Design a protein around this ligand. Structure first.
Ligand code: CDL
Ligand code: PEE
Ligand code: PEE
Ligand code: HEM
Ligand code: HEM
Ligand code: ANY
Ligand code: SMA
Lengths: 61, 146, 101, 48, 380
C-alpha cells in the first residue's frame, strides 16, 4: 500500500519529510519545466525562433 | 513543581482484552492547564525520541517494586490471580515478570512508545474551567518532534 | 389597526436572527450599559444566553442555521434584559443630571 | 513595444498551472484543519 | 520562570501573541483576510519598489528612459515593473474591500483601530500618487500638476503650499526628485502606522459577523487563521499575477506611454481608476473650492461613520434595511466611478452631480436614519 508505505517511510519522520520535499521538488522542477515549455512551444509551432532558426543559422554563406 | 504546574498528574496504561487506553491525567488551576499539558506532551515526545539508559534503569527498579507491592497480603494476591487467569490466560509469576523487565532497555522504550504515541490522533477529556487549554489541532500537533 | 404590530412582527422575521435561535436582546451590541445589565442577570438566565450565543457562533462558522422548527417565534421572544437595562440607564441618567446640579 | 511578450505568456502558463495545483492543495489543508471546527457538536446540559 | 521559550523570549513573545496564540473569533468570514492581504500588498510594493528604485533615475531628462531601460534591459525588470504597478491596483482593491467589510459589520466601532485605518488609506493614496508621477509620462506630469494644485484652493498658505510641493514655480525636475524621495519614504510610514493599526486592534480582539461577544468561542489564530491566510494569499495572488502576466496594461492608461509634455495636456485625461470616484465628485462641483472641498469630505467623511452609528445592534447582518442601503451605496460608488471615466457632457454631468448628492446623503442621513427607525421596529 503506497499511502502506508509512504506515510510510514517519508511523511512520518519530520526529518525525512524534508528530504522528500527537496528531492521531490527537484524532480518536480525538471518534469514541469519540460512539459510546460513543451505545451507552450507546441501551441506555437513554427512561430518561434526555435523554428525559423535553420533558415539563417548556418544556411547561407 | 518548579512552575506550580498541576495539583497532581498521573500516568496510566489501562489495559483490556483486545484494546487499551495509554495516557495521562492531571488536575490544575484554570490558568496553567496549558503550560502543563505542554510539558506533559513534551515528555511523551521525549520518550519516543531521547529516553536514556539511566532513565529506564530506574523505572525498571520502580516498576519492580509496585510489581511486588501489588502482591502485599492475601486479597491483593488473590486479585492478581483472579485477574491473571481471566485476562492473561494463566498466572504470571514475579520471577517471570522480572525477566521481562530486566529485558527492556532504552532502544525498546523509544521504539515502543513511538510505536503507540508518535503522530497518533489522541483522545482528550476536559472537565471544569478549561478555557486556557484549546484546539485539538494544537494538542494534536503536540504529538510529534521533541 | 394592527399595522404597527403586523410590522414589528415583520421586521422581526426580516432580521431573521431568530434563525440562529437568538433572542432579540441576545443581539444587543454590548455597550457600557448593556455590559452592566448583563452583569445583573440571574445565573440561569445568563449561562443560557451564553450558550445561545456559543451556538449561534458555532453556526455562523459552519455557515448554517437552525432547522425552521427551532427558529425563535416573534411572540415567544423573551426580553430577558430589556427591563434590567432600562433601570441601569435610569440609574445613570439620575447620577448624570445630579452631577450638573 | 514589449519584447518580453512571449516569455511573459510562457510564464503566465506555468504560473496558472502551479497556481491551479497549489491553490487546490491548500484548500484541502485549510479544510482539513478546520474540519475540527466544522464537524464540531455541542449541547447545554445545565445541572438539576 | 517560564517553560516554553515561545512565551518568555522578548521577541518570540511578540511573534507569539500576534501570529500563534492570538485569540480569534471562530466565525470570521473571507472579508477578514483583507487585512492580512493588504499587508502582503505592502510587502509586495516595498519589495518590488526597492528593486525598481535600484534602476530608476529621478530626473526629468532621464526619468522616462530609465524606467524604459529598467524594463527592457534589466533582467526580469519588466516583470518587476508590471508587478509593482498592478500591485498598486490590487493594493487599492484589497483596501476598498477591507473598508467595505469594516462598514457593513461596524468594525468602525473600534474607533482608534478605525481612525488609523483612514490615516493608512489617505497615505496610500498619497503614496500611490507620487509613485505614478515618477515615470514622468504624460499622465505622470499632468496628474502631478493637478493634484498638487488642489492645495492652491486653500487661502493664504495655499499658493505657497504648492511652491514647496513643486520646489519650483511650475512642476519641474525639483518636483520629480523630491517626489521620488517622498515615494521612497512613505511606504515605510505606512508600514509603521500599520503596526499601530494592529496594536489598537489587539486591544479589543477582532470583531465578527454576528456582532456579539465572541469570547464564548474563540480559537488560536494558528492553525486556524494562519492556514486561512495562506489560502487567501494564493487566491488573491492569482488574478494579480494573471493580470500582470497576460494583460499587464489592462488596468493602465496608455496615454502614459508618451513622455510628459509640459505644453500639451492630453485631450482625454482621466485619473488612475482607483481615484475616479473622487475625481467625479470634484468634477460635479463647478467651483474651484467647492470641488476641492467636496473631494476632501469625499474621503474625510470616513472619520465620521463611527459617530453616524445608531443601531442598537452592531452589524448589518440583522438589519435588512441598512443592508439594502449599504449595497445601494456600494453601487453608488460603482457609479460615481463610471462617471469619472466619462467626459464632461450630458447626461453624464447631471448623473454625476446626483450620485455625489447620493453618496453624501446615504452616509450622512439615510444611514443614521434607517438605523434609528430600525430599532423602533424591533421595539427598543
Ligand atoms: C475556493 C472557494 C470556496 C468555495 C465555496 O464557496 O465553498 C462551497 C462548498 C462548501 O460549502 P460550505 O460548507 O457551505 O461552505 C464553507 C465555506 O464557504 C468554504 O469556504 P472557506 O471559508 O473555507 O474559504 C474562504 C475563501 C473563499 O473565497 C471565495 O469565495 C472565492 O475566502 C478566503 O479565504 C479569502 C480570499 C479572498 C481573496 C480574493 C481576491 C479578490 C480580488 C478581486 C479581483 O465547496 C464546494 O462546493 C466544493 C468545491 C470543490
Ligand atoms: C532545486 C529544487 C528546488 C529546491 C527547493 C529548496 C528546498 C527548501 C526546503 C523546505 C523545507 C520544508 C520542510 C518543512 C516541514 C515543516 C512541517 O512540520 O510540515 C509542514 C507544516 C504543517 O505541518 P503538517 O502538514 O500538519 O504535518 C507535519 C508532518 N508530520 O507547515 C505548513 O503548513 C506547510 C505549508 C507550506 C506552503 C505555504 C506557502 C504558500 C505560499 C505561496 C506563494 C508563493 C510564491 C511567492 C514566494 C516568494 C517569497 C520571496
Ligand atoms: C470605492 C470605489 C471603487 C469601486 C467599488 C468596488 C465595488 C466592487 C463590486 C462588488 C464586489 C463584491 C461582491 C458582492 C458580495 C455579495 C455578498 O456576499 O453579500 C452577502 C454577505 C452576507 O452577509 P451576512 O448577513 O453577515 O451573512 C452571514 C451568515 N451567512 O455580505 C457581505 O459579504 C458584506 C459586504 C462586504 C463588503 C463589500 C463592499 C464592496 C466595496 C466597496 C467600498 C465601500 C465602502 C466605502 C469607502 C469610501 C471610499
Ligand atoms: C496599510 C493599511 C491597512 C492594513 C494593511 C490593515 C490591516 C488590518 C488587519 C491585519 C486587520 C485584521 C484582519 C482583518 O480584520 O481584516 C485589520 C483590521 C481592521 N482594519 Fe485594517 N488595515 C489597513 C487599512 C485599514 C483602513 C484604511 C481601514 C479603514 C479606516 C481599516 C479598518 C480596520 C478595522 C475596523 C479593523 C477591525 C476589523 C474587524 O472588525 O475585525 N483598516 N486591518
Ligand atoms: C505603498 C506602496 C507603493 C505604492 C502604492 C507604489 C505605487 C507606485 C506607482 C503607482 C508607480 C507608477 C508605476 C507605473 O508606471 O505604473 C510607482 C513607481 C515607482 N515606485 Fe512605487 N509604490 C509603492 C512603493 C514603492 C517602494 C517601496 C519603492 C521604493 C521605496 C517604490 C519605488 C518606485 C519606483 C522607483 C517607481 C518608478 C518605476 C515605475 O514607474 O514603475 N515604490 N510606484
Ligand atoms: C514578523 C512578525 C510580525 C507580524 C506582523 C503582521 C501580522 O500580525 O500578521 C497577521 C497575519 C495579521 N493578521 C491578523 O491579525 C488577522 C486577524 C483576524 C483575521 C485574520 N485572517 C483571516 O480571517 C488575520 O490575518 C496581519 O495581517 O498583520 C500584518 C499587517 C502584520 O504586518 C505588519 O504590521 C507589517 C507591514 C510590518
Ligand atoms: C507630494 C504630495 C502631495 C502634494 C499630496 C497629494 C494629495 C492628494 C491626495 O492624496 C491623498 C490624492 C492622491 C487624492 O485626493 C484625495 C486622490 C483621490 C485625487 C484624485 C484625482 O486624481 C487625478 C489624477 O490622478 C489625474 O491624473 C491622471 C488628473 C486629475 O485631474 C485632471 C485628477 C483629479 O482631479 C483628482 C481629484
Amino acid at each position: 500500500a503506497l499511502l502506508r508505505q509512504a506515510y510510514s517511510a517519508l511523511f512520518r519522520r519530520t526529518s525525512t519529510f524534508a528530504l522528500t520535499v527537496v528531492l521531490g521538488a527537484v524532480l518536480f522542477e525538471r518534469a514541469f519545466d519540460q512539459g510546460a515549455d513543451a505545451i507552450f512551444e507546441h501551441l506555437n509551432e513554427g512561430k518561434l525562433w526555435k523554428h525559423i532558426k535553420h533558415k539563417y543559422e548556418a544556411s547561407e554563406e | 513543581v518548579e512552575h506550580k504546574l498541576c495539583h497532581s498528574f498521573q500516568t496510566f496504561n489501562t489495559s483490556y482484552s483486545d484494546t487499551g487506553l495509554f495516557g495521562f491525567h492531571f488536575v490544575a488551576d484554570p490558568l496553567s492547564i496549558d503550560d502543563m499539558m505542554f510539558c506533559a506532551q513534551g515528555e511523551w515526545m521525549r520518550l519516543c525520541t531521547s529516553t536514556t539508559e539511566s532513565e529506564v534503569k530506574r523505572a525498571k527498579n520502580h516498576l519492580r517494586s509496585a510489581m511486588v507491592a501489588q502482591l502485599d497480603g492475601t486479597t491483593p494476591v488473590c486479585e492478581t490471580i483472579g485477574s491473571h487467569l481471566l485476562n492473561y490466560g494463566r498466572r504470571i509469576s514475579l520471577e517471570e515478570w522480572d525477566s521481562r523487565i530486566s529485558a527492556v532497555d532504552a532502544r525498546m522504550v523509544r521504539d515502543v512508545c513511538s510505536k503507540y504515541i508518535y503522530d497518533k490522533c489522541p483522545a482528550l477529556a476536559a472537565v471544569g474551567p478549561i478555557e486556557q487549554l484549546l484546539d485539538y489541532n494544537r494538542i494534536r500537533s503536540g504529538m510529534y518532534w521533541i | 389597526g394592527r399595522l404597527m404590530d403586523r410590522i414589528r412582527k415583520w421586521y422581526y422575521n426580516a432580521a431573521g436572527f431568530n434563525k440562529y435561535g437568538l433572542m432579540r436582546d441576545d443581539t444587543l451590541y454590548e455597550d457600557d450599559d448593556v455590559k452592566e445589565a448583563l452583569k445583573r442577570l440571574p445565573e440561569d438566565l445568563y449561562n443560557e444566553r451564553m450558550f445561545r450565543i456559543k451556538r449561534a457562533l458555532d453556526l455562523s462558522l459552519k455557515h448554517r442555521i437552525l432547522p425552521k422548527e427551532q427558529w425563535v417565534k416573534y411572540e415567544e421572544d423573551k426580553p430577558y434584559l430589556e427591563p434590567y437595562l432600562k433601570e441601569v440607564i435610569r440609574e445613570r441618567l439620575e447620577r448624570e443630571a445630579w452631577n450638573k446640579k | 513595444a514589449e519584447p518580453e511578450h512571449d516569455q511573459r505568456k510562457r510564464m503566465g502558463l506555468k504560473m496558472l498551472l502551479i497556481s491551479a495545483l497549489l491553490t487546490s492543495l491548500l484548500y484541502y489543508m485549510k479544510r482539513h484543519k478546520w474540519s475540527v471546527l466544522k464537524s464540531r457538536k455541542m449541547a447545554y446540559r445545565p445541572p438539576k | 520562570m517560564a517553560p516554553n521559550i515561545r512565551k518568555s523570549h522578548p521577541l518570540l513573545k511578540m511573534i507569539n501573541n500576534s501570529l500563534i496564540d492570538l485569540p480569534a473569533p471562530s466565525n470570521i468570514s473571507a472579508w477578514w483576510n483583507f487585512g492580512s492581504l493588504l499587508a502582503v500588498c505592502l510587502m509586495t510594493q516595498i519589495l518590488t519598489g526597492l528593486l525598481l528604485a535600484m534602476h530608476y533615475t529621478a530626473d526629468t531628462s532621464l526619468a522616462f528612459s530609465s524606467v524604459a531601460h529598467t524594463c527592457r534591459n534589466v533582467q526580469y525588470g519588466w516583470l518587476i515593473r508590471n508587478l509593482h504597478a498592478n500591485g498598486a491596483s490590487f493594493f487599492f482593491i484589497c483596501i476598498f474591500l477591507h473598508i467595505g467589510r469594516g462598514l457593513y459589520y461596524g468594525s468602525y466601532l473600534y474607533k482608534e483601530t478605525w481612525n488609523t485605518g483612514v490615516i493608512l488609506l489617505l497615505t496610500l493614496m498619497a503614496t500611490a500618487f507620487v509613485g505614478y508621477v515618477l515615470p514622468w509620462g504624460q499622465m505622470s506630469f499632468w496628474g502631478a500638476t493637478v493634484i498638487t494644485n488642489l492645495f492652491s484652493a486653500i487661502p493664504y498658505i495655499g499658493h505657497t503650499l504648492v511652491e514647496w510641493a513643486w520646489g519650483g514655480f511650475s512642476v519641474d525636475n525639483p518636483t520629480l526628485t523630491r517626489f521620488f524621495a517622498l515615494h521612497f519614504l512613505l511606504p515605510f510610514a505606512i508600514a509603521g502606522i500599520t503596526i499601530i493599526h494592529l496594536t489598537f486592534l489587539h486591544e479589543s480582539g477582532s470583531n465578527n459577523p454576528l456582532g456579539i461577544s465572541s469570547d464564548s468561542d474563540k480559537i488560536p489564530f494558528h492553525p486556524y487563521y494562519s492556514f486561512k491566510d495562506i489560502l487567501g494569499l494564493t487566491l488573491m495572488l492569482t488574478p494579480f499575477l494573471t493580470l500582470a502576466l497576460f494583460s499587464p496594461n489592462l488596468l493602465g492608461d496608455p496615454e502614459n506611454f508618451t513622455p510628459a509634455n509640459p505644453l500639451v495636456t492630453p485631450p482625454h485625461i482621466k485619473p488612475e481608476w482607483y481615484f475616479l470616484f473622487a475625481y467625479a465628485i470634484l468634477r460635479s462641483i463647478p467651483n474651484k473650492l467647492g470641488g476641492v472641498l467636496a473631494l476632501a469630505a469625499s474621503v474625510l467623511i470616513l472619520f465620521l461613520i463611527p459617530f453616524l452609528h445608531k443601531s442598537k445592534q452592531r452589524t448589518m447582518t440583522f438589519r435588512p434595511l441598512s443592508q439594502t442601503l449599504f449595497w445601494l451605496l456600494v453601487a453608488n460608488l460603482l457609479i460615481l466611478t463610471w462617471i469619472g471615466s466619462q467626459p464632461v457632457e450630458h447626461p453624464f454631468i447631471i448623473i454625476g452631480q446626483m450620485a455625489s448628492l447620493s453618496y453624501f446623503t446615504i452616509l450622512l442621513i439615510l444611514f443614521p436614519t434607517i438605523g434609528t427607525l430600525e430599532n423602533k421596529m424591533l421595539n427598543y
